[PDB]
From a paper:
The INCENP peptide wraps around the N-terminal lobe, forming extensive interactions with the kinase domain. The kinase-activation segment, as shown by the Aurora-C example in this manuscript, is a typical example of such a highly mobile structural element.
We therefore switched to co-expressing N-terminally histidine-tagged Aurora-C (residues 13–309) with a peptide comprising of residues 835–892 of the IN-box segment of the inner centromere protein (INCENP) activator, which had previously been co-crystallized with Aurora-B and which had also been reported to bind to Aurora-C. The resulting Aurora-C–INCENP complex indeed eluted as a complex from the IMAC column, but again the sample precipitated during subsequent concentration. The protein yield was significantly reduced in the absence of INCENP, indicating that both the INCENP peptide and a high-potency inhibitor were required to maintain protein solubility. Optimization of an initial hit condition yielded crystals which diffracted to 2.8 Å resolution. The final structure contains two Aurora-C–INCENP complexes in the asymmetric unit. Based on the absence of the salt bridge between Lys72 in the ATP site and Glu91 in helix C (8.9 Å distance), Aurora-C crystallized in an inactive conformation. The triple SER mutation allowed the intrinsically very flexible kinase-activation segment to adapt a new and partly surface-exposed helix. Both the observed new hydrophobic crystal contact and the intramolecular interactions which pin this helix to the kinase core could not be established in the presence of the original arginine and lysine residues in positions 195–197. In addition to a SER triple mutation, the Aurora-C crystallization additionally required the presence of both a stabilizing protein (INCENP) and a high-affinity inhibitor.
Numbering used by the authors:
A (entry chain CCC): 841 to 883
B (entry chain AAA): 32 to 306
């Protein structure tokens, strides 16, 4: 039961749009902040 | 979006499994709000702890937060759960290069020379900025919407390559004599691999491969390269100048870009950005 968007025409259309008309990435995903190892992992 | 943009799994709609990595699976997903398609890689925290790659992963994030290149697959950002670490990665619509090669049997001079320049460039960038990168070979390379080569990452999950492993994996070809023997190796190894990669893409199989392991071993150390007479002369030349026993006389990156054959057949074009 794969959603309509992630298959056939709907996806190729979405990829084509994303390729030729990409968004500002810095505004979409923000600044990559340093990985806090004490916060993320055990020990 | 002011200056917060902290993401969770609740911010994504999940589409389909794209494949299984060593540490965890990669799912095609899109942001709910913007509908921007990404490749979501789900790491098991317990697996990166087991392998002692806490620092390596930190370094991957630090590199990808400072460096960008159109022929190195992008990390947009990451989040983490109690159990999981999520990497939001650039989606490669045309998948794995090795898979495209088997389907194509061989790549024409155009697609091959376009990759070789793209890679030579990405690697010049990587050595200028003094950073490690994922060793180059068809398995480790992904493809953009117009077949732009993407180095999968800056090689944090890369394991110290074993002679025995490479023999069994059938990846002995991408190991130069220095590595094969006890001897010290630098980023001049990169030059050899591009030579191997170029031969593989054009012919369909790695130059040194055989039926015997001792044979493949002998052919590498004697650099016994054998070109099919159907091989374009320009290409034979480039591979002859890259696949040399002596590391210090291997055609440098600056001159792979300038090599006549590349010039004549490369159709490299940057993918669209915003600003």
């Amino acid at each position: 039961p794969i959603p309509t968007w992630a298959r056939g025409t709907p996806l190729s259309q979405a990829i084509i749009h994303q390729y030729y008309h990409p968004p500002n990435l810095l505004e979409l995903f923000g600044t990559i902040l340093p990985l806090d190892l004490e916060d993320i992992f055990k020990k | 979006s002011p200056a917060m943009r902290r993401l969770t799994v609740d911010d994504f709609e999940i589409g389909r499994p794209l494949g299984k990595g060593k540490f965890g699976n990669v799912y095609l997903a899109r942001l709910k709000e913007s509908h921007f398609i990404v490749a979501l890689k789900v790491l098991f925290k317990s697996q990166i702890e087991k392998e002692g790659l806490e620092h390596q992963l930190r370094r991957e994030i630090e590199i990808q937060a400072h460096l960008q290149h159109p022929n190195i697959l992008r990390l947009y950002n990451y989040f983490h759960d109690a159990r999981r670490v999520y990497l939001i990665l650039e989606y490669a619509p045309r998948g794995e290069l090795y898979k495209e090669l088997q389907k194509s049997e061989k790549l024409d001079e155009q697609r091959t020379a376009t990759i070789i320049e793209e890679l030579a460039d990405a690697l010049t960038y990587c050595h200028d900025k003094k950073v490690i990168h994922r060793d180059i070979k068809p398995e480790n390379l992904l493809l953009g919407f117009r077949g732009e080569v993407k180095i999968a990452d800056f090689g944090w999950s890369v394991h110290t390559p074993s002679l025995a492993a490479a023999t069994m994996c059938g990846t002995l070809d991408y190991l130069p004599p220095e590595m094969i023997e006890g001897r010290t190796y630098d980023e001049k190894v990169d030059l050899w691999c591009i030579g191997v990669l170029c031969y593989e893409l054009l012919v369909g199989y790695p130059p040194f491969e055989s039926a015997s392991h001792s044979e493949t071993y002998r052919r590498i150390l004697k650099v016994d390269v054998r070109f099919p007479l159907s091989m374009p002369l320009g290409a034979r030349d480039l591979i002859s100048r890259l696949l040399r026993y002596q590391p210090l006389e291997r055609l440098p990156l600056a001159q792979i870009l300038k090599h006549p054959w590349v010039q004549a057949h490369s159709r490299r074009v940057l993918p669209p950005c915003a600003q």
